[PDB]
Design a protein around this ligand. Structure first.
Ligand code: CXC
Ligand code: CX0
Lengths: 305, 312
């Protein structure tokens, strides 16, 4: 029995709605191809119960899913099974607006109306790019877009795949994009989002060796050249470090052990490295709309190995 | 596994979608220890506005409303009907025939008026109490769900109930029994006509069910019609259908050119096998119908006296 019991009611609706839309979709055949109307399409349901099923859901709420055929195909192209997607959203309420599924596999971010407009303006070219690189990309991986209405207030959310491991703790984090640095305020939280400058003054490097590095650089170049060819900028590269040794301090998951089909942004450290670490790296914040930025970004990221 | 909801008309496509949706939603709702009064005033409503999406068989825009869903789910249980069976008979394939039956001939769906829905509401508490007191064994209609469909801004009310006839045994002749009424020359020349009382009397058909079957039938008919009278209900009928075992044998064999008279009382719940010493081997289906509405007490008495006189 799925009760959709959640930390907040909007989360109960998110769970009900992803459950509902994924079931609905399972009755819609998979097309030979997507058509242009699939990029202008939407699913909308309005719920007015009365003295019924009110234990965990509101009696009245609205759920809208944008481009359901497109995002279903994207999910497939990212290797994500539709029932797995549904289970991570509905088996248990998401947690900590910014959320993750109970199982830490997927991320749910509240977004603006404008960001939705921007996702639409870029969706056809983004889908075409996803297919051209066979799902192997450092860009955000959008798995669904939804509009929730509960108490006459609309809330937009985008579900995408996590950059970090769903099982390996990320010990330090950096956000790379002038000069930007972390506040005495930011620096005082548990795991701070340190910006570029503080990572430079710290002097950490990531040794992945030539073989890994070459193909990684290939993929980063492809992504930023695409984002430039769409005149998008102010995007960042998010990078997280996991120290196996620190993690140390009946089937047992091993130390620094992970599944690359699941933690798709992860890389093991090279043999010639100071500490044994695992790294997660991917591009973020790509919905706020120059080409020159592509150049500075790629050169910046280039000098770490 | 894919359900397409393909139907000859959009209303049936919505019917199938809605029974599917409501039975699934219900599957996440715990089954209560008992019903509460709010369950008799409750309803579920969904409104669907798709756009350039999922348009092959469903309208892009439609609404579906289910009345007292907890109650009809309990009724489903008390009639021995599984919810998964219910949804499958309605949604594996479009129903056929407004008044229609599911593809598998198990269940019947009748359009009704708004007033019929109000009347079902006013009587539902006492009807549920009656169903539970008789452990589901009754000749009355067995209501399994009540729905309101809106397609092209038009509301259509529908009641799902169990078929009086067998889902496997062919009904060869049928009557509607309650002054004097008979079947029209229009009716009398139709495929399987609805013969009224007078044609049954002038024809002189009788039903040989043997003593024990007759006695149990008359006992439950008395309980049922006293209930309907205690509800000041009238204009209801007794529906009667005849299956000739020997004829069914021949017509299976004749389609072959190009057991017999056995049935499941768990499934064909209005059915009765013919007495051992009976001219022909027959099966009978009999039930009360049309109860969503000169004196009701006299109606009960006369109805019971009449129907008493058509059995052996
Ligand atoms: N005795 C009783 N108890 C109830 N609990 C009950 N419930 C409904 N009925 C009646 O049937 C109609 C159903 O559609 P409703 O009219 O209710 O549908 P609703 O009111 O949402 O919107 P509409 O105005 O667009 O139709 C009602 O107007 C009544 O005529 C009820 N009757
Ligand atoms: N096999 C079967 N099983 C049932 N449960 C069942 N219930 C009702 N019928 C039909 O309802 C109508 C009476 O109901 P009513 O609306 O007053 O007359 P019509 O307008 O339809 O002529 C008649 O056609 C009955 O034969 C049924 N047939």
């Amino acid at each position: 029995v799925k009760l959709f019991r959640a930390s907040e009611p909007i989360l109960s609706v998110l769970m009900w709605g992803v459950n509902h839309t994924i079931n609905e979709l399972s009755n819609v055949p998979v097309p030979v191809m997507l058509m242009p109307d699939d990029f202008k399409a939407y699913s909308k349901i309005k719920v007015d119960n009365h003295l019924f099923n009110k234990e965990n859901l509101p009696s009245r709420f609205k759920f809208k899913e944008y481009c359901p055929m497109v995002f279903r195909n994207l999910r497939e192209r990212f290797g994500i099974d539709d029932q797995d997607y549904q289970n991570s959203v509905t088996r248990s309420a998401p947690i900590n607006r910014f959320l993750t599924t109970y199982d830490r596999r997927f991320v749910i971010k509240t977004v603006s109306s404008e960001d939705v407009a921007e996702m639409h303006n870029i969706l056809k070219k983004y889908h075409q790019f996803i297919v051209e690189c066979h799902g192997n990309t450092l860009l955000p991986q959008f798995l669904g877009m939804y509009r929730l209405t509960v108490d006459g207030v609309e809330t937009y959310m985008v579900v995408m795949r996590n950059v970090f491991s769903h099982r390996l703790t990320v010990h330090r984090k950096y956000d790379l994009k002038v000069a930007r640095e972390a506040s005495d305020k930011e620096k005082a939280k548990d795991l701070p989002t340190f910006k570029d400058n503080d990572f430079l003054n710290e002097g950490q490097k990531l040794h992945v060796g030539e073989e890994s590095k070459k193909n990684f650089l290939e993929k980063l170049k492809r992504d930023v050249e695409f984002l430039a060819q769409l005149k998008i900028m102010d995007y960042s590269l998010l990078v997280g470090i996991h120290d196996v040794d620190r993690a140390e301090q009946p089937r047992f998951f091993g130390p620094g052990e992970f599944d690359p089909s699941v933690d798709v942004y992860a890389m093991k450290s090279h043999e010639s490295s100071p500490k044994k670490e695992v790294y997660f790296m991917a591009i973020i914040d790509i919905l706020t709309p120059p080409e020159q930025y592509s150049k500075r970004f790629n050169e910046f990221m280039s000098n770490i190995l």
